[PDB]
Amino acid sequence: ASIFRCRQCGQTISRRDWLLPMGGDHEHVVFNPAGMIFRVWCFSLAQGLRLIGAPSGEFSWFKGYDWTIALCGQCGSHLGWHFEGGSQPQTFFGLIKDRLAEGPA
Ligand SMILES: O=C1CC[C@H](N2C(=O)c3ccccc3C2=O)C(=O)N1
Numbered sequence: 001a002s003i004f005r006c007r008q009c010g011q012t013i014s015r016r017d018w019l020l021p022m023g024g025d026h027e028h029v030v031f032n033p034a035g036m037i038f039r040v041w042c043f044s045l046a047q048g049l050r051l052i053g054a055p056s057g058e059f060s061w062f063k064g065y066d067w068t069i070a071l072c073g074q075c076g077s078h079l080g081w082h083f084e085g086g087s088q089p090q091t092f093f094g095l096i097k098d099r100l101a102e103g104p105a
């Protein structure tokens, strides 16, 4: 199981080989201001998304990064966020682990 697809429609999104240990773990669990919990997996790279609007620094979970919502490009399901404007790396993807399906290439 080396590739991740959108759990709702099957759109190709990312790969196990593209997981990124930010802060020493690719997995981060975080809460938004509405108290929703997200088990976030960091990826260096993703595809098949649509990044919505312009970046925002408000409530950013990752120091020095601004965020844009990442929808599945096919079905519109909220898969995570694209993070940017930071350093080493300048950008990365934080994707919600239970909204993805993992399986064979
Ligand atoms: O790093 C992030 C990404 C965006 C995320 N976020 C949300 O998931 C959310 C839902 C409702 C209102 C405001 C927010 C918000 O800033 C958040 O809390 N931090």
Ligand SMILES: [Zn+2]
Residues within 6 Å of the ligand: 006, 007, 008, 009, 010, 011, 072, 073, 074, 075, 076, 077
């Ligand atoms: Zn989808």
